[PDB]
DNA sequence: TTTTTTTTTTTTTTTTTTTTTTTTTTTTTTTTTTTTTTTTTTTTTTTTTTTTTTTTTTTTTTTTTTTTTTTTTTTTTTTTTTTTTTTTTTTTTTTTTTTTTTTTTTTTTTTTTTTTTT
């Protein structure tokens, strides 16, 4: 499913919150400007559940 | 004066078509059955002061495994093309307004005759 969707601008740092006690931060500018009906880019090597 | 040719509507009854009585399938419609909303009050739940012993964060230091890292080659991403769907101009058709032209039906009442059934 889709975890959550927020509307953001360039150079705004985004954080994740795993349900197995994890939190990460990657500048949003690192990742390429995606398009519709495409695949996805990995973010977090979240092992297990 | 007798006798000879031709013309059509009827004895027609049968073939073709039309008209008129019929009853399977998807679209309506009334019923029962399950989702919603407002009150009473009711034990019951729940909001807020005081005290208390607790158990997790912050002085300080340690390491190691996730954060550094560079690079090969994949493969998702993007490009062009074409098909399918959505949506809006365009057109067509139909309805209502008020003076005109035309029509068409259902029943009482009595008395007499046809026209079927028993």
């Amino acid at each position: 499913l889709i975890g959550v969707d927020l509307t953001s601008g360039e150079d705004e740092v985004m954080l994740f919150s795993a349900e197995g006690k994890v939190v990460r931060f990657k500048e949003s500018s690192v990742r390429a400007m995606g398009c519709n009906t495409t695949g996805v880019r990995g973010i977090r090597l979240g092992e297990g559940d």
Side-chain angles (χ1 to χ4, degrees), chain A residues 16-48:
Chain A
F16 309 79
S17 61
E19 297 171 1
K21 64 179 180 180
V22 183
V23 293
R24 281 286 134 185
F25 271 80
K26 61 111 183 50
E27 302 182 3
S28 57
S29 63
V30 173
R31 197 157 39 70
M33 311 302 285
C35 303
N36 289 337
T37 77
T38 70
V40 278
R41 289 87 176 181
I43 37 159
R44 173 68 205 98
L45 304 176
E47 299 181 3

